[PDB]
Structure formats: structure tokens, C-alpha cells
Design a binder for this molecule. Structure first.
Ligand code: RHQ
Ligand code: RHQ
Lengths: 572, 572
């Protein structure tokens, strides 16, 4: 029942059965031919006794090794290679989700967990497929075949004295559990001691201040003493643990192998059957670890499959929206948008705003306010619940999010560089037209070409795998350039010039505002220095808009102290 | 040669040889009796042929197990418990050093490294002593005895074909190295892939904004496919590693054990000799892993001893030196004092300041310019290569200045809550609590108890481990009270945080200013609150110190063009 989702997930990558079935059958044949080795060995002993049959068999035996290896080789590869083909394409699908699926909010839950999914659960499924399931089948067949060979081989006598040994050795596991618990409490006490010293030593200043060492050291004398006491206990426990694993195992060997002594002394004709029995003893000892590891790993594998099937669900609606792109220079309206992230949690409520075409709009409010949510709903990253975004004849619901977001240029305060060469950011967003080498003039109108004219190579200027060898205030110029050179329709900025120290601020403004002041702008602001240039300001508080109009008129009308106090406190 | 420091370090805790020698002898006897076991197992097998004498001797084996384990217990216990007696004592010594030894600058180098040195490194030494050296001796004795027994037991025939097996199996180790290298490069490429996705996924806002998923997805296709390619390679390598092991070992078995078959078919009287040999086989395979682990761990253990002896070196000798501290109220003069960290990097240079019996003395300056070092220089955390400090030249530094430390009223950001209660802080002050019967009403006089009157118990009130549940100002006031209640002759203060500015600072200021109306103080807290609380200033720049009088004349002379910068920066 629970394996049906896993089988379906494997079926998602269909190139599986045709060679996987052959690989599994090949491994079964490998196990079967492996079970015939000790039978050949048991005939070889009698041949060596006399001589010539021994030479001939020593040969044949060699053969039944190499094929047993050789075939097995072509077995595991035919599995293992296919295992990668099972994983790779699977990752493919997951990637085809984890970039197409995530509407921004879905990716705001946990980026680290999501990235760890497609790098750990894939490995877990690979281990389950390539080794663990084949190991399970191989171990099951090997164990049952060895048992049946020992039944038909003897009079269920040596087999009986063998199978009795695990029954008595079952008592060994509780000793192991006791040792594990004692050891674990030992490291627990060690961690407590380490915490005590990591609390005392960093505060050595106060200890030295009042010559208190005579008592502080005293505490340490307690600490180690506790450890010592605990140590004594484990030693005593180890005194009863150490020999016991050594003891019973001795008996176990003497219980079984020496038992075969009868069979080779006077009981039966077991001279070579004894070496065959020892070979089968190794044959059965080998796969127990594999079988128990598979039985343990099955739960982790099914959990990984559950996370995969959870992630694979749902899909974005870029094409589902439609295709109604046009001049897209109409004024924007917000009407009674009332939602945050949940229907019950109303971060925003009953908001209406007007933004005229070609008019600069800025947003001011507290950090805990709805400024960020307002910005993300303007960029349509959040699906509206009840409020309406208004353009000519209500086209936003069918305004081709691909094309609508194409018309939008974006820039943020963080300005994080996408790692790689500078050519990545140079050509990013220029899809459907490489435009040849006109990028240089687009850069120079943005005042970035002259700045970057330090010019190591213009394409080998790699920001690095971590993207760290560039100033934080540097990416603003290239971001403005890339926004302007393809999408000069509407731009959105999020406090990208707060910390440029009024020197890079002027440098980036004399490009941006000079080149694109004729287009619609939406701005999230942190300072009054950038809102004076804005024709319209919107003040957010308590999840509601309470400020409309020009900076001075709104400031005198309703902004007043409600904004002076906050802005000066930020200044202070 | 290199083991001489380790032997000396063990000798530092002398309760060692008397029982360790007996434990080693008992372990050797255990090895001998274990080696004797398989010889007994042969006669019992000729006896299993005989029947009666076999039952009687099958007995004796039981005894020679219960002794073999039994004595071994009293061996390992005597080796283990007594072993702890070293480590505990060793830690003892370390603690007796790690509090007496460290002058403040010695502790400034590292804190977590030292607790690692005193816990994990002691654990390594314990693992060397209690098990690894006994493991080495046991393995050597067992291997030599097994070889000698097989020599005197099988004349150059079975032993030779046995020892040939490791010679051929030596080729396995290069295969293991190849597999390990391939696997390691596999996780390296996996880590590279994880880094790529950790670069990309957090940037999903920008990725979606420019609707470039179509190309970004391509990058993912470049990633997994590479892994797939690499995976294919390792699979091929795995195809040539898996069976080969299962070949080379298995042939080995039939190379030797099947060989023993001839010895029991027509060779000679090997019926019980075969089972004795197969049992010696495990008896010799066991200690190989132990001897290898000991050889690997010897280097780590000798490094452990090196770190131990490095830590134990040198000791702070101010404890006994010095005498005749009676008044602690004569004028103090600093003159010609210059020291940083090394004779070529003097942070401080030829400075002189006078405090006399004045009310206060405040140090002002840029961060790192000398404010932080003078605070500890006055109260002797560092011993400078500097001029004399005229307190009579502290009687030419002949005061018992370790005992003079019972004059500090150290103030800081604090939160140095050692142990876990307020009564723990009381116990911390047990230096001279012979009059502890009357100190709590002094705390009432110290104005603290009224604030502490919100007491849950006040006799066992837990401050929480690491002290993360108390207000900062609460620790401020309680520390001030605990300092002043006995030894208020000298006050140390250094404040760098102003989170709870108004209430906490005003309360502590009024309380202290009431509570040292007749004592000299040293304070470095802030620009202007400090001076309106203290009314005297000193200023340090580039090491050099200057100041004479109250704030106003210092500003008129020195602060006219320098201190306004600090005022504006702190106002920001
Ligand atoms: C005092 C002299 N002999 C000491 C002798 C010992 O003899 C052993 C022989 C063995 N071979 C014959 C079947 C095996 C497998 C384990 C043995 C143990 C042993 C017991 C418990 C855990 C580990 C071992 C151990 O060393 O690990 C082996 C997996 C053992 C242990 C000690 C301390
Ligand atoms: C392709 C089918 N799956 C496998 C089948 C295997 O057959 C093995 C059979 C013996 N067989 C008796 C004929 C031994 C000793 C190891 C075997 C190994 C083996 C090889 C290298 C290292 C460890 C083992 C292993 O499991 O550890 C034991 C040393 C092994 C491993 C796998 C994955």
C-alpha cells in the first residue's frame, strides 16, 4: 500500500523496467551460481586426496568464480547505471517544479529545507534502488538457499546446532543496549562538564577580580569527580560487558564448528562437507548486515518519497492567466484588497490607492507595516483574495503574467549579485533578442560603462562562485542598465539607495531619474531624501493606507507629526 | 624518545604502576589461555569420536572459558577503573593550572579551544591508556602465539598457504583507495551542486521577475547531467570493485580452508587440527583491526600529550609574591608607562596620569586607541615593560597585588552569572564571609534588595543556566551591591552598551553615587552621562594620555576640534 506512491514516483521517469528487470534477474542468477561454490569445493577435497580429478576440478572451480564475478559485474552496472538514470531525470522533474511551481510565498517557508530535499532524498532513493532492494533480494535468496542446502546436505543435525546459536546469542543484544545507554549517558555527562567549563572560563575576568579561584577551582574538583564516579560505573559495566561478547562467541564457534568434528571424526563422510559447511556459514553471515540495513533504510526511503511527492504537487498559472498585453501605460488602481497570507490573518484590509500614468509613487511606513506586502501584491507575487487591481476594463486577472512581469523592471535594497561572470548579469533578461553588441551603449546611457571601464575583460570579470568580489552599492548601476535596456515601461525600486552615502546615490540617480523619469515608478522608501522626488506618497499603518497625495500636501494634511516623529527617530 | 614526555605526564599522577602492571600481566595471561583454548578443542573432537572421555573433557572446556573470561574481567576492570584514576587526576592538574596559570591575556587567545584541550584531549589519552596499549600488547602476543602454534602444528604447509593469502590480498587496498577517491569526488560534485542551488533558489524573486526560468532551468539541466555523467563513471568503477572483493576474498577461503580439506581427506591426522586451525583463524583475524587502530591512534595520542604539556607550562606566580597592603588609599600616579603586546608593536607610548585621592577618573578616546588597555593596566591584568606606577611605585610593586585584587568594583556589560542563583553569587563572595551573618541588610542598605524584593524564593532562586532570563539592569545593580558590600575602596567600570538607557542607568547612578561618597573610582561609560555623573575626564589618543580638570576646560583646550566628532558619532 505505502509502496504504491514510491512505484508511481519511479514511474514518473519511465525508462526503468526494460533493463531493471534484467538486472534483478541477473543478480538472482549471480546469487544462485554463488550457492554452488561450496558444492564444487566439497568435491575438490576428494579429488585432491587421489590427485588428477583434483587438478581438473581446481580448474572448473576457477571458472565458476570468474563468471560468478563477471556476470555479477554486468549485473550491478546494469542496475547501478540505470539507478543514476532513475535519479537524474527525477531531479529533472523536481527542478522543473522548484522553478516553475513556486509562487513567491510558497518559497518563503524554507529555502534550505527545499534545496536539501533534492540533494538528500534523491541520494536516499538512489541507495534504495541501486543497492538496498537488490541487497534485500540477494540476501533473502542466499539465506534460504544456504538453509535448504544444509537441510538436504546433513540430517538436520549441524543445521540444528547452528540455528540454536542465534537463539542463545539473542541475549547478547540486551548487553549491547546496556552498553549503548551507559556510553550515551557518559557523553551526556561529558557535555555537561564541557558546558560548565565553557561557562566558567570566558568569565575568568570576574574570577580573577576577587581572588575567588580557591572556590572556582573547587567547583571543577566536583565536576571531574562526578565524571570519575560515572567513569567507575561504566568501567564496572565494561568489566561485565567486555568478556561476555568474547565469551559466548567462543562457545558459539566451539558449539558449531567443533560439532562438525564428530561429522569428520567418526560420524559421517563429512571430510569435505565440513569445509562446504564453513563456506555456507560465511555465505549466511554475509547478507545479515545487508538485510537489516535494508529493513532499517526502508522507513527513511518511504519518508523521502513522501517529501518528494509533497513537493511535486501544485503548479503556477503563468499561461493560465491568458494573453492580453498592450501599451500598458494605464494608471493603476487598488480597491479593497484585504488579505495577508491567510484568510483569517488580515495583514491588509480595505485598501484603495490611485497611481496615475507616469507619476512617481513612493511608500512610507513602519517596518512591521504592510509596505512589503503592498509591494509584493503590486508585483503580483501574491494572488489577491477579494480586492481588485484596476486598469482599463479590468484586464489584470488576464494580463499575461509572463508579459506583464516582462514589462516590469525590478531593483531592491539588497541588490544581490547572481554568481558567475559579469556577462551573466549583462545578458540576463535579454531573452528573445541578444541585440548583438548594442549592450555597450545601453550601459553608457546608464552611466555604468564608464564606471566599469576598469574593464578586466568585460566577460571574465567573474563576481565569483560566492559572488563576493564586488561592492554592495555597485550592482545598482548594472541593475538599472539591465532594467532600462529591455523593459522601459514600469520600474519598481525598494530602497536601493539608502546606504550609498550620497556619492553613489547621486551617481545612480543621475542615470536612473534622468533616463526614465517619463515612465511609471513604484518605490519602497526608507528616507525622506528619496520621497521628495516622488510626486505621490502612500503612508501605511496598521495594515491600512492613511496617506495620499504629494509629499508636502500630505505632510501638512495628515502626515504631520505621525511621519515627522518616525522619520526623525530613524534619523536619530 | 617521544614517549618520554607522555611517561612523565602519566608520572605526574603517581597512583599508576602498582595496579597497572598487574592488569597488564593479567591481560597477558588471558591471551595465553585464549591461545590454549583451541588445543583443548582438538582432543574433545577426537573424544567426540571416542564418546565418554569426550563428554568428561567437554566439561574442562567450560572451565577454561569461565576462567578465560573471568580473569579477563578482573583484568580490564583493574585496567579501566584505575585508568580513570589517572585521567580524573590529570584533569585535576589541568584545572589547578587553568585557573592559577592564566593571566588575562593568556585566556584572550582562545576559550573553546581550551575546553576542547581539557575534555576531548583527555578522552583521547584515556582511550590510549585503558584500551589501546592493552590492545597492542594483546594483539602482538596473540598473533605471535598463533603463528608459533601453527608452525609447531602444521609443518610449513597450511601456514604457508595461509600467509600467502595476505600477500595476494594486498592488491585489494589499492582498489579500496580508488573506490574511496571516486566516492569523495562524488560528494565533492554533490556539494558543488548543492552550492549552485543554494546560490539560485534564494534568488527566485529576481529569477521570476525577469521570467528567465526557461534559461535558469537550463543551468539546472547542466548540473544534474554532470552528476549523472560522474555517476555513470563511478558506477563503472563500482562494477569493477564490487565483484572483485567478493572474488579475491572468496578464492582466499577456498585457497586455504579447502586446502585444509586434503589434510583431513588423506593428508594426515588433521581431523581435530582442522577445527583448531579454523578457530585460530578468527583468533588471529580479530587482533589485526585492534593493532591497526592502535598504530593509527598513537600519533593522535602523542599530539595529545604535546598539547597537554604545552598547556601545563608556566604559571602565574603573583599569588605568593607581594606583601604589606594595608590602606589602598594613598595617591596613585601613572608615569612613563608604555606597552602593547610585543616589544615591536607598542600600543601604549610614554603616558602619565595622576588620580590621587580624587573622586573619579574617566578615560575617553577612539575605540582601540587605548581606552580598553588602561582599564586593565590600572588593576594589573597585564604586566607592562613600562615605567613605575607611583603608589610608592606601588611600594615598587611589592604590595601583595594578587590579594589587593579584593578591592575591585568591576562594572561592565556584565551578565557573568556563574552557577545559577543569587545565593550562588553570595557563595562566590565567600572570601571573607566570616561575618556573613550580617551582609544581607547591608544589601538592603545597598538599595538592591528593594528591587530584588520581587523574590520567588530568594534562597534558591534560579537565574537559569547561562543566565538568559534576567534584565540587564538587574545584573548591573546586583553586581554593584555585591561588590560594594565589602570592598568598595576602588571602583572599576567600563560600559559599551546602552540598551536599557534611561531607567537602568539612572537607578544604578544614584545608587552607586550614594554608595561611594568617599572612594576613588575609574569609569569608562559614555560621552556625557559619564561626565555629569563623575565630573572628571582623561582622554587617550594614539596611546598618549592627556587631561587635567573637568569637562569644560578639556573641551576648550583639547576637545574643541576632536570631541565634537565623538559627540556627533555617538548621537548618531
Ligand atoms: C583480553 C584479550 N582479548 C580481549 C579478547 C577478545 O577476543 C575476541 C576474539 C574475537 N574473534 C574470535 C571469534 C572476536 C570477534 C572478539 C573478541 C573480543 C571482543 C569482545 C567484545 C568486543 C570486541 C572484541 C573485539 O575486539 O572486536 C572484534 C569485533 C575480545 C576482546 C577483548 C577485549
Ligand atoms: C551486487 C549484490 N550486492 C552485494 C553482494 C556482495 O556479495 C558479497 C559476498 C561474500 N559473499 C559470499 C559469496 C562477501 C564477503 C561480500 C560480499 C559483498 C561485499 C563486497 C565488498 C564489501 C562488502 C561486501 C559486504 O557486504 O561486506 C562483507 C565483507 C557484496 C556486496 C554487495 C553490494
Amino acid at each position: 500500500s505505502k509502496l504504491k506512491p514510491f512505484f508511481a514516483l519511479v514511474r514518473r521517469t519511465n525508462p526503468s523496467y526494460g533493463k531493471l528487470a534484467f538486472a534483478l534477474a541477473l543478480s538472482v542468477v549471480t546469487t544462485l551460481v554463488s550457492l554452488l561454490i561450496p558444492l564444487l569445493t566439497k568435491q575438490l577435497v576428494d579429488g585432491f586426496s587421489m590427485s588428477n580429478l583434483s587438478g581438473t576440478q581446481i580448474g572448473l572451480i576457477a571458472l565458476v568464480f570468474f563468471v560468478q564475478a563477471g556476470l555479477s559485474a554486468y549485473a550491478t552496472y546494469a542496475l547501478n547505471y540505470n539507478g543514476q538514470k532513475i535519479i537524474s531525470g527525477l531531479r529533472e522533474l523536481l527542478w522543473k517544479k522548484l522553478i516553475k511551481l513556486p509562487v513567491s510565498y510558497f518559497d518563503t517557508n524554507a529555502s534550505g529545507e527545499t534545496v536539501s530535499r533534492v540533494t538528500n532524498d534523491t541520494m536516499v532513493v538512489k541507495e534504495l534502488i541501486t543497492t538496498h532492494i537488490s541487497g534485500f533480494i540477494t540476501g533473502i535468496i542466499s539465506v534460504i538457499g544456504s538453509l535448504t542446502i544444509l537441510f538436504i546436505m546433513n540430517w538436520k543435525l549441524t543445521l540444528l546446532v547452528l540455528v540454536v546459536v542465534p537463539l542463545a546469542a539473542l541475549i547478547l543484544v540486551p548487553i549491547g543496549r546496556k552498553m549503548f545507554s551507559i556510553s550515551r549517558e557518559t557523553q551526556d555527562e561529558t557535555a555537561r562538564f564541557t558546558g560548565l567549563l565553557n561557562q566558567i572560563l570566558p568569565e575568568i575576568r570576574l574570577v580573577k577580580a576577587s581572588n575567588a579561584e580557591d572556590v572556582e577551582y573547587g567547583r571543577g574538583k566536583m565536576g571531574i569527580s562526578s565524571l570519575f564516579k560515572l567513569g567507575v560505573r561504566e568501567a564496572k559495566v565494561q568489566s561485565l560487558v567486555g568478556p561476555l561478547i568474547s565469551l559466548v562467541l567462543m562457545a558459539a564457534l566451539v558449539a558449531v564448528i567443533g560439532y562438525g568434528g564428530m561429522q569428520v571424526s567418526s560420524g559421517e563422510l563429512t571430510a569435505g562437507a565440513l569445509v562446504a559447511f564453513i563456506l555456507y556459514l560465511f555465505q549466511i553471515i554475509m547478507p545479515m548486515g545487508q538485510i537489516t540495513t535494508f529493513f532499517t533504510q526502508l522507513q527513511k526511503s518511504i519518508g523521502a518519497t513522501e517529501r518528494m511527492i509533497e513537493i511535486l504537487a501544485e503548479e503556477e498559472e503563468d499561461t493560465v492567466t491568458g494573453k492580453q498585453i498592450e501599451n500598458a501605460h494605464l494608471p493603476i488602481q487598488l480597491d479593497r484588497v484585504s488579505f495577508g497570507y491567510k484568510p483569517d490573518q488580515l495583514i491588509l484590509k480595505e485598501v484603495s490607492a490611485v497611481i496615475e500614468a507616469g507619476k512617481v509613487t513612493a511608500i512610507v511606513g513602519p517596518s512591521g507595516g504592510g509596505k512589503t506586502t503592498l509591494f509584493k501584491l503590486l508585483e503580483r507575487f501574491y494572488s489577491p483574495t477579494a480586492g481588485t487591481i484596476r486598469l482599463g476594463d479590468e484586464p489584470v486577472d488576464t494580463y499575461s503574467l509572463e508579459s506583464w512581469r516582462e514589462h516590469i523592471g525590478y531593483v531592491s535594497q539588497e541588490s544581490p549579485l547572481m554568481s558567475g561572470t559579469i556577462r551573466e548579469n549583462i545578458c540576463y533578461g535579454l531573452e528573445r533578442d541578444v541585440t548583438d553588441a548594442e549592450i555597450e551603449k545601453a550601459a553608457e546611457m546608464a552611466y555604468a560603462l564608464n564606471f566599469i571601464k576598469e574593464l578586466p575583460n568585460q566577460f571574465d570579470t567573474e563576481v565569483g562562485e560566492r559572488g563576493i568580489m564586488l561592492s554592495g552599492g555597485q550592482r545598482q548601476r548594472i541593475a538599472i542598465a539591465r532594467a532600462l535596456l529591455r523593459n522601459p515601461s514600469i520600474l519598481m525600486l525598494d530602497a536601493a539607495t539608502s546606504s550609498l552615502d550620497s556619492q553613489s546615490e547621486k551617481s545612480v540617480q543621475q542615470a536612473l531619474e534622468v533616463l526614465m523619469e517619463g515612465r511609471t515608478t513604484i518605490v519602497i522608501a526608507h528616507r525622506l531624501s528619496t520621497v521628495v522626488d516622488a510626486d505621490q506618497l502612500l503612508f501605511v499603518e496598521k495594515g491600512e493606507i492613511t496617506g495620499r497625495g504629494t509629499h508636502h500636501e500630505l505632510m501638512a494634511s495628515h502626515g504631520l507629526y505621525r511621519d515627522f516623529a518616525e522619520q526623525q527617530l530613524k534619523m536619530n
